[PDB]
Amino acid sequence: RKYFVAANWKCNGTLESIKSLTNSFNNLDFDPSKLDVVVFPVSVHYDHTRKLLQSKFSTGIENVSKFGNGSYTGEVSAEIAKDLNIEYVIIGHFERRKYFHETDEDVREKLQASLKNNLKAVVCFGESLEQRNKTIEVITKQVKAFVDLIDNFDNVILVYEPLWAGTGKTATPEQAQLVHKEIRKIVKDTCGEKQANQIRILYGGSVNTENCSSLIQQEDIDGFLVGNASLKESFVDIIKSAM
């Protein structure tokens, strides 16, 4: 199973900061055929980001439209992503679910549009503080909402976002692992044992240079969707933890 370290820059950065950050990223020697390394910048920063990054770094977009091409203002369709050579998209990130009101129905439709247009999909999900001893219940409902559409278990990457860890609570690798194995059990029951063992499951909580080793060494944790720490040059040490 190939490891998958993803940087989600969210709504952050300038031309100068990307030039500085991508140059620091470039300096790390790693084998792209042994380790997947993906950076997700802002839509309007994509062209700039793709130019500055070396080809060992994969790239993608932080969202994709639930519709196709046509009269859908302010949206990026999966066709346009495929035409521009965009390899990855993120779908169902907690901030889109929370602020922009993306439902499990929208995540499914976004996944269908991505896979039909030969895009790889980083699919996010996870439970709140109040919900955590209902964790398995919630994650089962979220995974099953899209999981049957997965046509290739190398091109779809699951992300566990513990929303229970802007609350004050801190998640341990042990708590991550327990959920991770249950996510893989959900894939086993729905899509089969062979396909549950193919798929990458990322940890999309608070990841930094100190906790990534203890996390990535866990059995069912296959990489990260890293937020704030990926805006630092020290993001290379999080990539190093998966080498």
The residue from 62, 102, 109, 161 that is catalytic is 161
**CA 202, 207, 212, 214 torsion-angle sign:** negative
The residue from 45, 93, 109, 180 that is catalytic is 93
Binding residues among 62-81 for a second copy as defined by CB under 8 A: 62-63, 65, 67-77, 80-81
What is the C-alpha R_g of the chain? 17
CA distance 94 to 240: 26
Nearer to Na ion, 81 or 196 (CB): 196
Specify whether the CB–CB gap between 92 and 63 falls below 8 A: no
Size of residue set near a second copy by CB under 8 A = 44
Please report whether residue 93 would count as binding a second copy according to CB under 8 A: yes
Judge whether 109 counts as a catalytic residue. Answer: no
Binding residues among 192-221 for Na ion as defined by CB under 5 A: 221
CA distance 108 to 90: 12
Judge whether 161 counts as a catalytic residue. Answer: yes
Binding residues among 190-229 for a second copy as defined by CB under 8 A: 227-228
Residues 6+ apart with CB under 8 A from 203: 159, 160, 176, 180, 215, 221, 223, 224, 225
Strand partners, 160: 125, 203
DSSP class of residue 33?
Answer: T
Annotated binding site for D-glyceraldehyde 3-phosphate: 8, 10, 166, 225, 227-228
Annotated binding site: 8, 10, 166, 225, 227-228
Q: Which residues bind a second copy (CB under 8 A)?
A: 8, 10-15, 42-48, 61-63, 65, 67-77, 80-81, 83-84, 86, 90, 93-96, 99-101, 227-228
